[PDB]
UniProtKB/Swiss-Prot annotation, chain B:
Location(s) in or outside the cell: Plastid, Chloroplast
Gene encoding the protein: rpoC2
Free-text function comment from the UniProt entry: DNA-dependent RNA polymerase catalyzes the transcription of DNA into RNA using the four ribonucleoside triphosphates as substrates.
Protein family according to the UniProt entry: Belongs to the RNA polymerase beta' chain family. RpoC2 subfamily.
Protein's name according to its UniProt entry: DNA-directed RNA polymerase subunit beta''
Domain of life: Eukaryota
Organism: Nicotiana tabacum
Residues of the full protein shown: 1245 to 1334 of 1392
Subunit structure, interactors included: In plastids the minimal PEP RNA polymerase catalytic core is composed of four subunits: alpha, beta, beta', and beta''. When a (nuclear-encoded) sigma factor is associated with the core the holoenzyme is formed, which can initiate transcription.
Amino acid sequence: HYKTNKPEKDGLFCERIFGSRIRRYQMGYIKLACPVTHVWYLKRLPSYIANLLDKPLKELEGLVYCDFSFARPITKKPTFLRLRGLFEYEIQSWKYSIPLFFTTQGFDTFRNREISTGAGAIREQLADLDLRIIIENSLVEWEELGEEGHTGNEWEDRKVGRRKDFLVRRVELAKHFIRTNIEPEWMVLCLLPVLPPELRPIIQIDGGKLMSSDINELYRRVIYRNNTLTDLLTTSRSTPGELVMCQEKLVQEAVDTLLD
Amino acid sequence: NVFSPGELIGLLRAERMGRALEEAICYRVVLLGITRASLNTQSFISEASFQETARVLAKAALRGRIDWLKGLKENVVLGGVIPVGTGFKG
Amino acid sequence: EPKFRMSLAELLDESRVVPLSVYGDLEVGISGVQHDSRLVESGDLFVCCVGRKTDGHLYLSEADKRGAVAVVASKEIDIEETLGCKALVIVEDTNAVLAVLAASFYRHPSKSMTLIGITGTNGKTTTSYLIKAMYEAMGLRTGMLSTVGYYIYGDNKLESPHTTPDAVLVQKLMAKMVHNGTEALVMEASSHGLALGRCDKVDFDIAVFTNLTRDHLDFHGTEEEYRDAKAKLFARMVDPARHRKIVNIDDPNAAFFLAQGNPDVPIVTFAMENKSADVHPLKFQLSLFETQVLVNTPQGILEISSGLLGRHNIYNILAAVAVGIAVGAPLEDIVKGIEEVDAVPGRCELIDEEQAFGVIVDYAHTPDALSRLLDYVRELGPRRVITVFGCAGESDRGKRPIMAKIATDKSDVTILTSDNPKTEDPLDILDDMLAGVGWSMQDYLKHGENDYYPPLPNGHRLFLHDIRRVAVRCAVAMGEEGDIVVVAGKGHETYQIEGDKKEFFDDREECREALQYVDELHQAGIDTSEFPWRLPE
């Protein structure tokens, strides 16, 4: 509180959820309206998600940052929308005619099976991944590849070696998840942890003085954007998709910078 | 199903597997370096998390590695008694 | 004005309500005495209810718990412990108590005004409403009770949980209607309702069966039990040349029921192929919109009603023509009945009036009824037979595969959904239905990743979807001009219990909206020929 030197309720250095060693050991948690993805699970050169999804980094980067659409990310229920589209740069479908055809609220209950945009699409794709047939298909592709004997320049065999190395790395990554009790859909952050107050730089509060550091202001920014996002979602659902998708990107990039 | 095409296995383990298994196993001696050999160890706390500290933790958390505190700097970072000298029991 | 002659001890004494043990008198004010505890109210005498499920002692206990003033039972019942009036009377006879529950003046008005009972195996409610419309066109206001809603008298129908309400409550409602707002109180019940004792405890002026067959064989434990009960109820109160025995001559149970009872009652047959019945269609105008026939009979009317079904609706119209001609020999009076029969009621509904593909909403849950409706649709369906249905949770597990087999045997393209999840896991009973054709959900899902969808070995096609709304809209949109879409999942029902909660999102307005928006869908360029809609780009 300004000019009070008192911890404001439901803040960063608040009480009863953060607060003297119990205060140094207690932590907090923030719920996120939209899922986000770990910093070093994607952008880095070793892209475990890309190795598990058999798709180059370009499209997924697009789903996460830009607006691109998958044909059917989750394949567990019978689908009737034949799209066969890996990534759509623009939307050319009759989104107004198809949604208004069946019923209001009747389009929402089935749109998530085919039309999924954002980190939630990646989460749903990683969730229902059959880790026992992936290794089979990867091994049969490794056996088929390299046996035809098609020679050429260095760009040919170098690319073949890179492909088989990616395939072997995919097999090695998939064999672990079968016997490690670690589910692959945990790479996205549906909920973000909060660092304890004493671990953060905090000496004392006197006369409205705030010892917040850069990580503290990053946390303030991300919680501000998250509560604004959830307020926008709770206010009206018929708002434009552009502004809400831009804000979701904004929170995601913010939480990514915070994790980095 | 035993080993992958890209792996770094020990020399004695490779020789014993060759004497044991009949499946075609081909290995070539690789000369590691001062930095490269330290990045591939049986522990991730100290001997692996000293240079990168970013991917050595990522891959360890992805694999769910179980580290047995059989080193020195591991117990130094932990805070217990180092199993060297007076701490070495048995 | 809920009832009369039920708020005095002398009224119950005149009704031959002899319980052999009473305390004081029935001084408590009660509009109408109800045998059922739920039908009775607080401070009202409740007589013992005779039934296989609830006996006299259980009925008396439930009445004393609900606050009934008097409770009748074989043994001593402490009704005055939790009642508004200390006076009570325990009747050792459950049947006599259930009969005396209805007031004398209450049972007298409904028995004197009119009565029409229709207890048939198939197509009973299709003829009950037709007979009610014929009686209304004759100039006498009356109501016909159905399994969906209990309507003793009047156009409106009160909400009732069971298919057949309490006899005492039905008599009280009929008396209240006949007192003001209704000229006739006809109590119509099905075979199960007649065998239970709902319509049996009422003087029926005309007791005809629309379709006599094996009804309540598993409940009663013997064939022709409902027909025998209906014949006994008709013989209890029968008048010369007043009771009608109009029924199909092909059914032996109909002849067996007509043989019993008073022979002075008028007998007639409504069979079309039989020459003794003298009734015959003698016309070829069958269609999904209207099927008019030129009946040529001496007693029956000339014009017939437009029925949606080929033989079932025609049989119902032929059975109702007799009841319509009994009141008035002129065929002009049956015009209102024919119009009401062509109004496309909830059961075996006809196509929509809008220029679009035919839509038939039917009520088919049992395998035999589903099979006969599918056969009638195949006989009516010119080009294609498109059907969509589902199974209910915690139901007969052996019913799903035989239903799926009977559906896929005669239908070119069928959609399988979850009609009633009711806490049962989805995609589980759906896999049970898929196992009937030998397919598994895994095979169809791995084929769905491709764009082939191989058909059945017999040449037919099979589709499925989890949600009911989208699949029903697709089935309504995936139809040819001459083809008709049949929805046998639910008919007059308007409740979908998906898990613990229930949603009332099943009606014909959704089908009308889909048939209206299919024009915009086709204008947009979407392909609705098969399940994998070809979306442009």
